[PDB]
Design a protein around this motif. Structure first.
Motif, PDB file in Angstrom:
ATOM      1  N   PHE A 191      59.178  61.547  42.789  1.00  0.00           N
ATOM      2  CA  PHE A 191      58.891  60.055  43.140  1.00  0.00           C
ATOM      3  C   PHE A 191      57.743  59.688  42.346  1.00  0.00           C
ATOM      4  CE2 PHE A 191      56.395  57.005  45.638  1.00  0.00           C
ATOM      5  CZ  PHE A 191      57.234  55.823  45.476  1.00  0.00           C
ATOM      6  N   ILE A 205      52.952  66.711  36.583  1.00  0.00           N
ATOM      7  CA  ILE A 205      53.100  65.958  37.927  1.00  0.00           C
ATOM      8  C   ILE A 205      53.488  66.845  38.856  1.00  0.00           C
ATOM      9  CG2 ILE A 205      53.730  64.163  38.978  1.00  0.00           C
ATOM     10  CD1 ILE A 205      54.167  62.519  36.380  1.00  0.00           C
ATOM     11  N   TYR A 239      47.192  72.105  51.815  1.00  0.00           N
ATOM     12  CA  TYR A 239      47.665  71.058  50.561  1.00  0.00           C
ATOM     13  C   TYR A 239      46.336  70.598  49.790  1.00  0.00           C
ATOM     14  CZ  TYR A 239      49.294  66.667  48.126  1.00  0.00           C
ATOM     15  OH  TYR A 239      49.451  65.788  47.388  1.00  0.00           O
ATOM     16  N   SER A 272      58.927  61.145  49.162  1.00  0.00           N
ATOM     17  CA  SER A 272      57.614  61.625  49.144  1.00  0.00           C
ATOM     18  C   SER A 272      57.199  60.457  50.155  1.00  0.00           C
ATOM     19  CB  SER A 272      56.936  61.633  47.868  1.00  0.00           C
ATOM     20  OG  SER A 272      55.592  62.235  48.182  1.00  0.00           O
TER      21      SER A 272
HETATM   22  O1  LIG Z   1      60.700  69.397  42.284  1.00  0.00           O
HETATM   23  C1  LIG Z   1      59.508  68.856  42.780  1.00  0.00           C
HETATM   24  C2  LIG Z   1      59.401  67.208  42.275  1.00  0.00           C
HETATM   25  O2  LIG Z   1      59.826  66.990  41.176  1.00  0.00           O
HETATM   26  C3  LIG Z   1      57.966  67.123  42.551  1.00  0.00           C
HETATM   27  C4  LIG Z   1      57.490  66.422  43.983  1.00  0.00           C
HETATM   28  O3  LIG Z   1      58.107  65.014  44.236  1.00  0.00           O
HETATM   29  P1  LIG Z   1      58.084  64.186  45.560  1.00  0.00           P
HETATM   30  O4  LIG Z   1      58.345  65.322  46.767  1.00  0.00           O
HETATM   31  O5  LIG Z   1      58.709  63.142  45.375  1.00  0.00           O
HETATM   32  O6  LIG Z   1      56.353  64.091  45.811  1.00  0.00           O
HETATM   33  P2  LIG Z   1      55.455  63.366  44.588  1.00  0.00           P
HETATM   34  O7  LIG Z   1      54.601  62.738  45.881  1.00  0.00           O
HETATM   35  O8  LIG Z   1      56.015  62.555  43.801  1.00  0.00           O
HETATM   36  O9  LIG Z   1      54.714  64.312  44.038  1.00  0.00           O
HETATM   37  C5  LIG Z   1      54.238  64.258  42.605  1.00  0.00           C
HETATM   38  C6  LIG Z   1      52.872  64.805  42.485  1.00  0.00           C
HETATM   39  O10 LIG Z   1      52.045  63.758  43.043  1.00  0.00           O
HETATM   40  C7  LIG Z   1      50.936  64.135  43.653  1.00  0.00           C
HETATM   41  N1  LIG Z   1      50.323  63.071  44.586  1.00  0.00           N
HETATM   42  C8  LIG Z   1      51.277  62.146  45.113  1.00  0.00           C
HETATM   43  C9  LIG Z   1      50.937  60.902  46.005  1.00  0.00           C
HETATM   44  C10 LIG Z   1      51.764  60.234  46.615  1.00  0.00           C
HETATM   45  N2  LIG Z   1      53.012  60.179  46.449  1.00  0.00           N
HETATM   46  O11 LIG Z   1      51.210  59.354  47.214  1.00  0.00           O
HETATM   47  C11 LIG Z   1      49.331  60.960  46.199  1.00  0.00           C
HETATM   48  C12 LIG Z   1      48.386  61.843  45.462  1.00  0.00           C
HETATM   49  C13 LIG Z   1      49.116  62.870  44.635  1.00  0.00           C
HETATM   50  C14 LIG Z   1      51.285  65.305  44.274  1.00  0.00           C
HETATM   51  O12 LIG Z   1      50.311  66.172  44.746  1.00  0.00           O
HETATM   52  C15 LIG Z   1      52.341  66.008  43.114  1.00  0.00           C
HETATM   53  O13 LIG Z   1      51.341  66.670  42.504  1.00  0.00           O
HETATM   54  O14 LIG Z   1      57.393  68.450  42.545  1.00  0.00           O
HETATM   55  C16 LIG Z   1      58.205  69.189  42.289  1.00  0.00           C
HETATM   56  N3  LIG Z   1      58.026  70.682  42.511  1.00  0.00           N
HETATM   57  C17 LIG Z   1      57.666  70.974  44.256  1.00  0.00           C
HETATM   58  N4  LIG Z   1      57.373  72.279  44.190  1.00  0.00           N
HETATM   59  C18 LIG Z   1      57.744  72.742  43.240  1.00  0.00           C
HETATM   60  C19 LIG Z   1      58.228  71.676  41.885  1.00  0.00           C
HETATM   61  N5  LIG Z   1      58.328  71.987  40.949  1.00  0.00           N
HETATM   62  C20 LIG Z   1      58.345  73.353  40.443  1.00  0.00           C
HETATM   63  N6  LIG Z   1      57.840  74.079  41.367  1.00  0.00           N
HETATM   64  C21 LIG Z   1      57.911  74.169  42.550  1.00  0.00           C
HETATM   65  N7  LIG Z   1      57.409  75.373  43.327  1.00  0.00           N
END
Ligand SMILES: *O[C]1[C]([O])[C]([C]OP([O])(=O)O=P([O])([O])O[C][C]2O[C]([N+]3=[C]C(C([N])=O)=[C][C]=[C]3)[C]([O])[C]2[O])O[C]1N1[C]=NC2=C1N=[C]N=C2[N]
Length: 342
Positions: A22, A90, A176, A221
């Motif tokens: 996303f 990313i 996370y 997301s």
């Molecule tokens: O395959 C997969 C895809 O391309 C990625 C993820 O996507 P999504 O689920 O749509 O989610 P996002 O959210 O866009 O993520 C990207 C980046 O950014 C960051 N952040 C965000 C935010 C909001 N949205 O609001 C805020 C702050 C920050 C996060 O942390 C991240 O860095 O990725 C990929 N993957 C998964 N797992 C894996 C992969 N590639 C390779 N290997 C593995 N194991």
């Protein structure tokens, strides 16, 4: 073009990892809009098929799909990074698993694998890492005295990510957070120890709201979860998200672009934090955009976010790119769900 004194020449190639994601898809969109060529990676070409079609129609011959099935594999980027002047890493683990091992380790590994590839490729002059506000903190409703700046780190997440019992409903969130925190720390450490010939900047978005370009193969997301509420689904996971800051997906794309080409932005942690919100302000906006539609009633009061972020580089970037100020939450949500109109 628009961007004067851009550090990356017009039409330069930028590698964007996890381009089917996303946030990444918006970063790609903004790069293409500004005349840059993009080679976007995905674990499969099929995952990018719909987006490829979209970009081929809107930006003929500017986007190229690149397959990277294992972002941790040694040499994974040897071919796709060739000729790139910029890299936007990313891709990261977003399974929200409570397993520290399956989230943190890969997050750091993927980050360093991309950084090492850039360090080994002379053509790369700019690197932007997608971090998150969780690398600074996990939102704390109604708590005063919280000011996040570029020196703010979510050190508490590292401990909690492995001390909290699996019964704590915030377990996966802390894991996370630890993954994002440790991954970003590792990136800056790599820069200071190796001193590669490229500049690093990190973008730290909070809740990103915007159009899901490919609903077909993009879960969305953060925006996907919001769309589910729009469609009337109230999932408990939604309750695990406290009041915090939103940010337009468009603006996040612009922040990444700024980090990749603006000369005045170096070694910065750019917060993508436009304004505060909670599920009730989201529902209120839904009702305003679609006055005829039925939506869930308000959630119980969950407090409000009283924290403040140092958004100086973010504001500098937005102004430099000709899009000063943050896109409003109403317009951001409209980008996602549209509006009742014809
Ligand atoms: O395959 C997969 C895809 O391309 C990625 C993820 O996507 P999504 O689920 O749509 O989610 P996002 O959210 O866009 O993520 C990207 C980046 O950014 C960051 N952040 C965000 C935010 C909001 N949205 O609001 C805020 C702050 C920050 C996060 O942390 C991240 O860095 O990725 C990929 N993957 C998964 N797992 C894996 C992969 N590639 C390779 N290997 C593995 N194991």
């Amino acid at each position: 073009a628009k961007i004067d004194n851009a550090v990356l020449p017009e039409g330069s190639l930028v590698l964007v990892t996890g381009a089917n994601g996303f946030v990444a898809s918006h970063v790609v969109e903004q790069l293409l809009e500004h005349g840059y060529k993009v080679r976007g990676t995905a674990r499969s070409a099929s995952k990018l098929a719909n987006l490829q079609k979209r970009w081929d129609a809107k930006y003929p011959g500017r986007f190229e799909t690149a397959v990277v099935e294992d972002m941790l594999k040694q040499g994974a980027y040897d071919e796709v990074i060739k000729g790139a002047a910029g890299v936007a890493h990313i891709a990261s683990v977003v399974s929200f698993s409570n397993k520290y091992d399956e989230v943190v380790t890969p997050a750091i590994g993927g980050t360093l694998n991309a950084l090492r590839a850039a360090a080994a490729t002379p053509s790369v002059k700019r690197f932007v890492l997608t971090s998150s506000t969780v690398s600074a903190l996990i939102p704390k409703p109604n708590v005063e005295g919280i000011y996040l700046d570029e020196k703010s780190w979510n050190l508490e997440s590292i401990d909690k990510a492995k001390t909290l019992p699996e019964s704590d409903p915030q377990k996966s969130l802390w894991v996370y957070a630890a993954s994002k925190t440790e991954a970003e720390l590792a990136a800056w450490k790599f820069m200071d120890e190796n001193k590669p010939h490229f500049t690093l900047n990190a973008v730290l978005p909070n809740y990103t709201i915007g159009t899901i370009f490919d609903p077909e193969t993009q879960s969305g997301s953060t925006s996907g979860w919001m769309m589910s509420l729009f469609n009337g689904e109230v999932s408990p996971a939604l309750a695990l998200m406290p009041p915090q800051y939103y940010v337009s997906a468009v603006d996040i794309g612009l922040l990444h672009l700024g980090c990749l080409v603006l000369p005045q932005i170096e070694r910065r942690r750019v917060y993508g934090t436009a304004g505060t919100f909670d599920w009730n302000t989201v529902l209120a906006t839904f009702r305003k955009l679609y006055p005829s539609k039925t939506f869930p009633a308000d959630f119980p009061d969950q407090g409000q976010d009283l924290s403040k972020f140092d958004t100086a580089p973010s504001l500098e970037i937005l102004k430099s790119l000709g899009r000063p100020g943050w896109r409003s939450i109403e317009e951001s949500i409209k980008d996602l769900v549209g509006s009742e109109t014809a």
